[PDB]
């Protein structure tokens, strides 16, 4: 998905903590609303939350030689072959 595209996302809305507030044995903390309190990892700080959509799938909302050879189904092969052999395809395509 790129910017400007209208896309359908499927996944789950998750809550993401303010990770800057949490100290751990792995790494220290890195420091308007109140937030929660009381955790050992949180220390004396207070933890806020934000909503993030964890998308497991993305698709558009309305949708090479190898690619053409794979995509072309038998009806499409017959159609393009008949068009190639169509006499006066010039005027037919113009019209």
């Amino acid at each position: 998905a790129q910017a400007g595209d209208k896309c359908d996302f499927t996944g789950t809305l998750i809550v993401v903590p303010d990770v800057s507030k949490l100290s751990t044995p792995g790494a220290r903390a890195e420091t308007e609303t109140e937030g929660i309190r009381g955790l050992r990892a949180l220390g004396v700080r207070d933890l806020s939350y934000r909503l993030v959509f964890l998308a497991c799938c993305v698709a558009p909302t309305n949708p090479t030689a190898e690619s053409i050879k794979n995509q072309m189904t038998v009806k499409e092969w017959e159609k393009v072959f008949e068009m190639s052999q169509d006499k006066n395809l010039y005027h037919n395509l113009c019209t």
């Binding site: 990770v19 800057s20 790494a27 890195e30 993030v52």
Partner: protein
């Protein structure tokens, strides 16, 4: 001792496997043997030559090609992209003790040698890098956007104890965190420590940012970018604006700042560089081999080398032989000089291609962009004064004013190509005056007062007023440029699409021939291959410096004086010294084309011819006859001089036959080197001695 093995079969991972002592020693021996036994297709021992060319210049860095490493030693090529840090360390050690076998005293010059891998086939688009590539060797391409300065980074650090004299032993510095001692073994004091700045070993460090090239995939989208780390000799391998090709290890580490920025355990990434090439400098003199030099210097022996080089410029363009000649002289260039150490004059030659539409002027500029290294291309309104010369900006992170390179500074020893030059704005077009003559760009802005070097050859293309060139007017009367900008162009070129049905047939047949020849699937001399021409140009511009000692001063002065007299009555502008120096530069350029260390009379004749033919082209169509007669008769259209050599040969034969009755090629060339007629090859390819029944043979030397 540890025993040799089949390497490719093991139960360990690749990193663990090559870390173990047995296979490490086997890999070491294999790479040593590969260096000491690899040969070229012709049988030349490649790495003996490369190591000698390294140890001569003290470059302390050995470039190895993957595409023949895979040919010689399979398993080394197998393990290399999988465990690159370990294998490259082993390669460094093996290469070091090969180099100390070839040059035993080279440890005085350097104690460590880096193996740099080139032509890695697993190339990757810069935005296509994923977690699958982590800790593996990759190759990517992109434009360098930012560079730090060259900084000293700790590599083997010794710490002074915080409370006593003791030096805590060497810690190997990492790119992930600052290694630390904890507490001293002589006395267990702990915490802060002092670095021993004298005994600590440092290494060069430079961090660059590279992003996708603007024309590659960023079609209105923002480009992706990666950071890369250059260490030791790789620093100063590139600058901002360089379209580099980077090989390196895709390395990742924990970054708390990214973790708090994203709210997830996101790891920062960086490319530990192992080789930096450039996609415009596809060939360089530091990479030329002895065979390349040999075949270049063999080509220079041919008397047709000037015609071969002229025919070799833009070979898919029919005709325009004068244009190809002028572009060759500009592409090779003259010799810069500073007589007295107080008075600079440029060596570079500037060209202007004026003419009507559909005449391959822009196509010529595109060809010059492709063939020449350090070339750039710009067009009309797309260019600006500031972008052409140099620009002052708030630095992105410091926010202090910094000067930055423009077009003519990025092409400081290359070619700046300015297409549709007539259509620029005047404020944009007048910005290149200092760069075009004084070859500096002087900036006095925002507290910056300095002058940058711009030793650039400007090749420009333009249309006349109204698009179509009219022969009824002189060049000055229909070009719309002024004298200060016209006179800075050493070579003026006029191309006209006038109707001539036979020439139109020849041109059209050649164009159709090019279209059918290049399907995806006036020359008379055959060109060089373009790879050979690139090698020839880059050799000639560095390994040759033509000197000037005598050029027939009175001839050139007389020529220039009556050229000024005729120009006073008509419409092109030989400003006093610039045209004299244009001729000097063109003579030096012709000597450079022939790989001559000293300028000769033939080169001077060629320069005079170029100047005069360009001047005749700028005249009105009615005036060309009188002007051409004026310069052609007196001012040295020295086509050929066969009659003197014919009668010298006939005199020598008459004396010899008279002597015989009562080695003649040596007798001929002795008198030819006595009299100033030394270019005897024209006499042998001319019919004058042939209808007099004379002939030549390099073996028998009888005539």
């Amino acid at each position: 001792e540890s025993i040799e093995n089949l390497e490719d079969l093991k139960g360990h991972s690749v990193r663990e496997w090559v870390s173990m002592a047995g296979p490490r020693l086997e890999i070491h021996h294999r790479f040593k043997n590969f260096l000491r036994t690899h040969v070229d297709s012709h049988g030349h021992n490649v790495f003996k030559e490369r190591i000698s060319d390294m140890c001569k210049e003290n470059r302390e860095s050995l470039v190895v090609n993957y595409e023949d490493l895979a040919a010689r030693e399979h398993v080394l090529a197998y393990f290399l992209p999988e465990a690159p840090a370990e294998l490259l360390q082993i390669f460094d050690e093996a290469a070091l003790e090969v180099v100390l076998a070839m040059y035993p005293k080279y440890d005085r010059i350097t104690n460590h040698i880096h193996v740099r891998i080139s032509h890695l086939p697993l190339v990757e688009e810069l935005r296509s890098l994923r977690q699958l590539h982590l800790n593996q060797l990759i190759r990517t391409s992109g434009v360098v956007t930012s560079c730090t300065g060259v900084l000293p980074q700790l590599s083997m650090v010794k710490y002074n104890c915080n409370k006593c004299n003791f030096v805590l032993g060497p810690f190997c510095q990492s790119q992930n965190q600052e290694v630390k001692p904890g507490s001293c073994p002589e006395c267990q004091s702990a915490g802060p420590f002092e670095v021993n700045m004298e005994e600590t070993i440092y290494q060069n460090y430079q961090r660059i940012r590279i992003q996708e090239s603007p024309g590659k995939v960023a079609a209105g989208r923002l480009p992706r970018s990666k950071d890369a780390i250059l260490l030791a000799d790789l620093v100063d391998s590139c600058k901002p604006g360089d379209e580099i090709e980077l090989t390196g290890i895709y390395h990742n580490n924990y970054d708390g700042s990214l973790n708090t920025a994203n709210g997830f355990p996101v790891f920062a990434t960086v490319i530990l560089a192992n080789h930096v090439a450039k996609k415009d400098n596809k060939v360089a003199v530091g990479e030329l081999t002895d065979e390349d030099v040999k075949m270049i210097t063999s080509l220079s022996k041919d008397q047709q080398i000037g015609e071969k080089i002229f025919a070799s410029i833009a070979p898919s363009i029919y005709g325009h032989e004068d244009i190809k000649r002028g572009l060759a002289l500009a592409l090779f260039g003259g010799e810069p000089k500073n007589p007295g150490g107080k008075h600079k004059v440029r060596g570079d030659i500037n060209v202007l291609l004026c003419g009507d539409p559909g005449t391959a002027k822009s196509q010529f500029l595109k060809y010059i962009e492709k063939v020449s290294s350090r070339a750039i291309f710009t067009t009309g309104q797309g260019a600006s004064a500031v972008g052409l010369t140099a620009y002052v900006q708030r630095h992105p992170v410091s926010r202090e004013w910094t000067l930055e390179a423009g077009a003519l500074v990025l092409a400081d020893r290359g070619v700046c190509l300015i297409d549709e030059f007539d259509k620029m704005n005047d404020q944009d077009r007048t910005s290149i005056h200092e760069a075009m003559e004084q070859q500096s760009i002087s900036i006095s802005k925002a507290g910056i007062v300095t002058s940058l070097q711009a030793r650039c050859t400007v090749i420009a293309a333009a249309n006349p007023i109204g698009g179509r060139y009219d022969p009824s007017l002189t060049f000055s009367e229909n070009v719309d440029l002024t004298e200060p900008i016209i006179s800075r162009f050493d070579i003026l070129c006029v191309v006209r699409d006038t109707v001539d049905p036979v020439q139109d047939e020849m041109l059209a047949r050649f164009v159709v021939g090019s279209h059918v020849r290049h399907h995806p699937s006036t020359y008379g001399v055959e060109p060089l291959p373009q790879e050979v021409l690139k090698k020839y140009i880059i050799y000639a511009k560095e390994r040759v410096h033509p000197k000037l000692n005598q050029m027939d001063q009175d001839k050139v002065a007389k020529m220039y004086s009556d050229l000024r007299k005729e120009s006073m009555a008509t419409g092109s502008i030989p400003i006093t010294v610039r045209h004299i120096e244009s001729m000097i530069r063109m003579a030096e350029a012709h000597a450079r084309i022939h790989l001559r260390d000293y300028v000769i009379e033939d080169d001077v004749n060629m320069a005079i011819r170029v100047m005069l033919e360009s001047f005749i082209d700028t005249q009105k169509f009615s005036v060309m006859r009188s002007m051409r007669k004026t310069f052609a008769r007196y001012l040295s259209f020295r086509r050929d001089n066969n009659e003197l050599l014919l009668f010298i040969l006939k005199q020598l034969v008459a004396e010899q036959v008279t002597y015989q009755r009562n080695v003649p090629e040596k007798d001929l060339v002795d008198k030819a080197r006595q009299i100033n007629i030394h270019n005897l090859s024209a006499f042998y390819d001319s019919e004058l001695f042939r209808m007099n029944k004379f002939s030549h043979d390099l073996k028998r030397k009888m005539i």
